[PDB]
Amino acid sequence: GGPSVFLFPPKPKDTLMISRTPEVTCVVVDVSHEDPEVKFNWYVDGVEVHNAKTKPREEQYNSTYRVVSVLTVLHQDWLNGKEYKCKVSNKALPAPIEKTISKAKGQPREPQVYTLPPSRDELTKNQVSLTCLVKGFYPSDIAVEWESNGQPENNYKTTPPVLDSDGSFFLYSKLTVDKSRWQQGNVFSCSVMHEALHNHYTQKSLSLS
Amino acid sequence: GGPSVFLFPPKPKDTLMISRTPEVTCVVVDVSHEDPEVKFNWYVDGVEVHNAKTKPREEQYNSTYRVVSVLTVLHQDWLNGKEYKCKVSNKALPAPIEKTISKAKGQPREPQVYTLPPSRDELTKNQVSLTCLVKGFYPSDIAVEWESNGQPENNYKTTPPVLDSDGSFFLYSKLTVDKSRWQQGNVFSCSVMHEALHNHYTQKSLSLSP
Ligand SMILES: *[C@@H]1O[C@H](CO[C@@H]2O[C@@H](C)[C@@H](O)[C@@H](O)[C@@H]2O)[C@@H](O[C@@H]2O[C@H](CO)[C@@H](O[C@@H]3O[C@H](CO[C@H]4O[C@H](CO)[C@@H](O)[C@H](O)[C@@H]4O[C@@H]4O[C@H](CO)[C@@H](O)[C@H](O)[C@H]4NC(C)=O)[C@@H](O)[C@H](O[C@H]4O[C@H](CO)[C@@H](O)[C@H](O)[C@@H]4O[C@@H]4O[C@H](CO)[C@@H](O)[C@H](O)[C@H]4NC(C)=O)[C@@H]3O)[C@H](O)[C@H]2NC(C)=O)[C@H](O)[C@H]1NC(C)=O
Ligand SMILES: *[C@@H]1O[C@H](CO[C@@H]2O[C@@H](C)[C@@H](O)[C@@H](O)[C@@H]2O)[C@@H](O[C@@H]2O[C@H](CO)[C@@H](O[C@@H]3O[C@H](CO[C@H]4O[C@H](CO)[C@@H](O)[C@H](O)[C@@H]4O[C@@H]4O[C@H](CO)[C@@H](O)[C@H](O)[C@H]4NC(C)=O)[C@@H](O)[C@H](O[C@H]4O[C@H](CO)[C@@H](O)[C@H](O)[C@@H]4O[C@@H]4O[C@H](CO)[C@@H](O)[C@H](O)[C@H]4NC(C)=O)[C@@H]3O)[C@H](O)[C@H]2NC(C)=O)[C@H](O)[C@H]1NC(C)=O
């Protein structure tokens, strides 16, 4: 009978590196032509702040609109658990919509990062799988990349975080490389970014031993 | 805001073992007191079927009804990609609600199952991680289990399927064992059930290599 509001956290990576800009994003769907104007109010722990930015809106292929406010956040505020309140008012709304988001609560825990070589069985293929196991980490916000010789390896896929039996999270990252690259003896690095790591970052190497 | 309909597919194990009973489940929620009568029609590839089993409505604590209908599917109908339509009629609807579900479309691909021992750096811990890599399967419906010496191992978690570059899926299963059980030389088995495996099953073993 009116729109819907959705609130999104910053990218894990954006909050760990001071050079990057972490953003909280407030998204309004089902905005129809007849009642086209949406507003936004923002709050960080009950205050209001004014540095949010409304980027102008897009017509959907179902003839409705998508409208987005974007608040930049302080890295340390996000990591310290401050609460970020989106407030949406619209003529079709009977009561304004508040929505809230925050970082997962609890003592952060350091990921353990382990590289595993391809299995003997796989070595009959033209391409092989380099595995990075990242386990024991909390909260689930994490970024994982691969490189070789300081250069980014982009042919990888990473699983979402999975809740482990001790309340921490784990994931696996799979890098796929030409078998010959693995045989010739190239070093591949899995890098992991996480708040509980020293300087928010660690790398583990993997090469043919 | 009238009733809504959720249509649930069978369990991956159920469609792969003839001994099991695969079901499609159509569930209707937010049925009102003022219009409580619900009708289901079921279709398999658009042809009506009449062997569903519908339970009588159950009132929820929020003063709405929930109504469930169960269709028993034949194993080979599901694997052959038949489509299952639940049609739901209620006098609070302006038109009946239809939902359709089937096995994801595309040519099935056989999973490659590879087992991977603990990192050397992990054998510092009291517990260690045995890994099962399952890749290159399609569709993503799969079941993964661990055992040793006949019996199920409880302490394992499996990732959801992840869409790979080539349009197939992969996942990993992690089994956590006490380091001594790995040092003692016990054999552990990752078994995988998928429609593109022979007898829909394969099992690969892992053990401390001498
Ligand atoms: C008219 O058109 C639009 C567009 O159609 C869409 O695009 C077209 C081209 C076609 O492809 C369509 O098939 C396609 O659907 C329709 O818009 C869709 O409408 C629904 C609402 O009805 C929205 O659903 C919400 O989605 C969010 C997740 O949103 C992210 O992921 C989407 C991809 O999966 C992506 O499209 C979104 O843009 C968004 O992406 C994120 O964006 C941020 C900011 O940009 C970015 O920083 C992120 O990186 C990015 N992430 C990505 C890309 O992965 C989902 O969270 C919502 O689910 C909650 O609410 C449900 C209730 O509807 C509920 O069932 C769920 O359980 C879930 O509930 C919450 O879960 C959490 C955690 O458990 C928690 O808060 C609570 O437990 C619970 N909260 C509750 C219950 O309130 C929700 O599903 C789509 O975003 C939207 N699509 C687009 C493109 O905007 C529209 O419906 C059409 N209108 C019609 C047909 O009438
Ligand atoms: C009034 O009460 C009733 C019952 O509530 C009950 O009583 C109240 C008082 C409280 O005590 C409640 O806590 C209690 O539960 C409420 O009914 C609920 O209504 C919601 C909708 O508002 C339904 O939500 C859907 O949930 C399903 C998941 O449902 C399974 O899992 C649930 C737990 O996770 C479990 O509770 C359910 O029973 C059900 O369990 C499965 O059951 C099948 C069949 O029996 C069984 O074989 C399975 O083994 C079993 N699984 C289990 C137990 O784990 C979820 O799938 C739905 O998500 C879709 O819809 C969203 C839009 O609504 C969308 O945003 C989501 O992304 C998702 O959308 C789909 O996305 C997929 C890909 O993700 C895609 O393929 C589809 O195209 C897409 N579909 C779309 C867009 O439409 C959804 O979240 C609850 O299940 C239902 N509860 C029950 C018990 O039936 C009612 O809302 C209350 N009314 C009020 C308060 O006004």
From Swiss-Prot, chain A:
Keywords: Adaptive immunity, Cell membrane, Chromosomal rearrangement, Disulfide bond, Glycoprotein, Immunity, Immunoglobulin, Immunoglobulin domain, Membrane, Secreted, Transmembrane, Transmembrane helix. Glycans are attached at residue 62. Changing residue 123 to M: In IMGT allele IGHG1*03. The keyword Ribosomal protein does not apply. Disulfide bonds join 26-86, 132-190. Residues 1-105 are annotated as: CH2. One of its GO terms (biological process) is adaptive immune response. Residues 3-102, 111-207 form the Ig-like domain. One of its GO terms (cellular component) is blood microparticle. Residues 106-209 are annotated as: CH3. Glycosylation on Asn-62 is required for interaction with Fc receptors and ability to activate the complement pathway. GO terms for molecular function: antigen binding; Fc-gamma receptor I complex binding; immunoglobulin receptor binding. Constant region of immunoglobulin heavy chains. Immunoglobulins, also known as antibodies, are membrane-bound or secreted glycoproteins produced by B lymphocytes. In the recognition phase of humoral immunity, the membrane-bound immunoglobulins serve as receptors which, upon binding of a specific antigen, trigger the clonal expansion and differentiation of B lymphocytes into immunoglobulins-secreting plasma cells. Secreted immunoglobulins mediate the effector phase of humoral immunity, which results in the elimination of bound antigens. Immunoglobulins are composed of two identical heavy chains and two identical light chains; disulfide-linked. Interacts with FCGR1A; this interaction mediates IgG effector functions on monocytes. Interacts with FCGR2A and FCGR3A. It is linked to Multiple myeloma: A malignant tumor of plasma cells usually arising in the bone marrow and characterized by diffuse involvement of the skeletal system, hyperglobulinemia, Bence-Jones proteinuria and anemia. Complications of multiple myeloma are bone pain, hypercalcemia, renal failure and spinal cord compression. The aberrant antibodies that are produced lead to impaired humoral immunity and patients have a high prevalence of infection. Amyloidosis may develop in some patients. This is Immunoglobulin heavy constant gamma 1. The chain holds residues 119 to 327 of 399 of the full protein.
